[PDB]
Design a protein around this ligand. Structure first.
Ligand SMILES: Cc1nn(C)c(O)c1C(=O)c1ccc2c(c1C)c(=O)n(-c1cncc(Cl)c1)c(=O)n2C
Ligand SMILES: Cc1nn(C)c(O)c1C(=O)c1ccc2c(c1C)c(=O)n(-c1cncc(Cl)c1)c(=O)n2C
Ligand SMILES: [Co+2]
Ligand SMILES: [Co+2]
Lengths: 381, 381
């Protein structure tokens, strides 16, 4: 059931902004590790005396990495005279965020028809304002409201390349890496209590609950009208034998925040070969692989969608497979992206639900919990 | 002239510690960019609830990258009960350093015979104490005194692998990269006034002035008895046509600090080929190459030490060459390692002064200033 109750017109995920202490090093690590090209910059070389911001792209996926310069460089400026290319940036806010959470997502940015209207309607409907609508070079409007913890939902709209004040990077310094990643599929937040977070966010967006089908979580997925913008939220399940990873997140993150980014690949086998090649030479590590009994059981579960060659190719790369009533999902998870056991990345590919492909096709892999438990028992035997 | 006036017994450079906000990402970038292997860790997985520290090694070169966890993880501990593997670490100090300077060197660590005696003698002779001598697992003693700005000189001594509490890393996650870098040759600080910084540091160490032969600096090199520990210091030359890069450093760094690390390569041609291969895929960028007139002039300057093939091979990689009265120096400089125009790395190789090779052989390349100026004029013509 899809009531299509969006309170304003939402298009797609536009970008994800990380707040760091040094944007250069994080960005270069991510670029090599995920096969994303350097495509735009806003920094000292472009006249920005406030923050350094570097954009990585792969397909439609846009990762923005931002860090503050010394406030002394811009002590003379006022908001009307600022050289910051992202007007919502605040030195104090950024340093506070990073010292409290470490490396993490500050903004989930969705493109809308009218950022000003989206902000006004949102705030009219309970959204806590974070940064008012600002019009950039009469071309782009940006606005921000609080999402959960210190994460904001950022509205972007275009009258008619990233943002004004960003320069395209010299493609001597722009190597065309690409491991097949194409777009952001979903972005997941961890909160201490799911109910009030859902009510708040659904309240100001009109996003509806996406239909789902002893893991440590309860969760729910908010979706836009066409279900291309997907914003799941988890809370911990306490009192279990094994400690909830959601709770472990909240402890090490100092509260609520974004837990994982799921990036869609057009060829998850090529992506995972390319990423695993680089795990120990600057890239990303992956979750420990499941026991081969897991692979000795998915011919009986998806043997009509994957050949015996492809299911074995899943066993090399450590891919998990799950199935809705309408589609199939291939997925794998990185180890945490930074020092703390907080944010991580998920690579996914969806098979089915062709009309274009409809969003959420195959679900989000919650079935792999009991399947991995089951498999672990059978591998012990 | 070498008076050999060391007030205590100094052996060699032991390690360089960077203070960052996320040690994982900086360390992985450096590892890939410089060809350094991951060799030890101290973090949550080893019981350290205070800081994450990751050691990279290449030959004798040791880079340590450290970042703070949330203070909440160790709120119950006291210094006697600490799980920190580096007892001098302080959450507040580290966050303050990084927000003030950004990514940068916190400690220049030299190995001594007796860290306790070196600290006592140093403080007796004017050194500002930073962290008293602490004995680690009855095996290693560490002590710290202020060097300049927020940089400390760290004394390490061993009774008889990095430090207690560090674990060797699983060499599944330890890929044996190596681009030829072998040891730290010198470590250079920028200060607003050279005189008082020299007097202070020479005052408590007994290090002597290393004999040297419109650049924006005045400098001087302090050296230990065998001149293997080399600690140059610069100050800006003001009032010039072109603004002093030392002054630009002090502005963007918020004061004094370490300016560059010079790393010795056993094959600077292989190192520079390997590093330049990776510049645009996660590694380090290099200074813009000098005009070919520079290369059309060094046959007349070092044509007796480098063949015509090797001097052309210098022209590909952008290597600079300078000459003392006793040796020859090959050198090149990276662009700054992080967001700010502050710290950078120098790769060098020295040719001559064989007895082992004596330190400082060939100098530090100050002659390349007027040679580059001259060359630039001749290339205009
Ligand atoms: C759930 C969920 N709901 N929504 C809306 C999503 O997008 C998701 C997921 O992506 C998803 C799906 C299956 C997973 C995991 C995740 C994050 C996961 O994290 N782990 C896990 C790995 N290592 C240590 C621990 Cl404690 C747990 C698993 O085993 N499975 C099977
Ligand atoms: C000097 C010095 N003294 N001691 C003790 C040392 O170790 C050094 C050096 O290493 C050294 C030697 C030659 C250099 C440079 C450096 C750091 C340098 O930085 N630059 C430069 C590059 N790009 C922009 C600007 Cl403004 C300046 C140059 O041109 N030359 C020729
Ligand atoms: Co997911
Ligand atoms: Co030097």
């Amino acid at each position: 059931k899809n009531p299509k109750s969006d309170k304003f017109k939402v298009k797609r995920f536009h970008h994800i902004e990380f707040w760091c202490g040094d944007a250069t090093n994080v960005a270069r690590r991510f670029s090599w590790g995920l096969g994303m090209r350097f495509s735009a910059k806003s920094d000292l070389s472009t006249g920005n005396m406030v923050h350094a911001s570097y954009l990585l792209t792969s397909g439609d996926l846009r990762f923005l990495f931002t860090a503050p310069y010394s406030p002394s460089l811009s002590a003379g400026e006022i908001k009307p005279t600022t050289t910051a290319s992202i007007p919502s940036f605040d030195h104090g806010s950024c340093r506070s965020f990073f010292s409290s959470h470490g490396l993490g997502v500050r903004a989930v940015a969705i493109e809308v028809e009218d950022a000003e209207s989206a902000f006004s309607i949102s705030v009219a409907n309970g959204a806590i304002p974070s940064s008012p609508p600002i019009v950039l070079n009469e071309a782009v409007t940006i606005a921000e409201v609080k999402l959960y913890g210190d994460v904001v939902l950022r509205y972007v709209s275009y009258k008619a390349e990233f943002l004004p004040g960003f320069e395209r990077v010299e493609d001597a310094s722009s190597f065309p890496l690409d491991y097949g990643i194409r777009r952001l599929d979903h972005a997941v937040g961890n909160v201490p209590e799911l109910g009030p977070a859902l009510t708040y966010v659904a309240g100001f967006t009109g996003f509806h609950q996406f239909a789902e089908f002893e893991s440590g979580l309860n969760s729910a997925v908010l979706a836009s009208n066409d279900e291309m913008v997907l914003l799941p939220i988890n809370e911990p399940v306490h009192g279990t034998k094994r400690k909830s990873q959601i709770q472990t997140y909240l402890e090490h993150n100092e509260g609520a925040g974004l837990q994982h980014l799921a990036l869609m690949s057009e060829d998850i086998f090529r992506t995972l070969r390319e990423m695993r090649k680089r795990s120990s030479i600057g890239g990303f590590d992956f979750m420990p692989s499941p026991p081969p009994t897991y692979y000795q059981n998915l011919k009986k579960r998806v043997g009509d969608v994957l050949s015996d060659d492809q299911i074995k190719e899943c066993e090399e790369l450590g891919i998990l497979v799950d199935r809705d009533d309408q589609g199939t999902l291939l997925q794998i998870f990185t180890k945490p992206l930074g020092d703390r056991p907080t944010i991580f990345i998920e690579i996914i590919q969806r098979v089915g639900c062709m009309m274009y492909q409809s969003g959420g096709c195959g679900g989000f892999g919650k079935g792999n919990f009991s399947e991995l438990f089951k498999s672990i028992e059978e591998y012990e035997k």
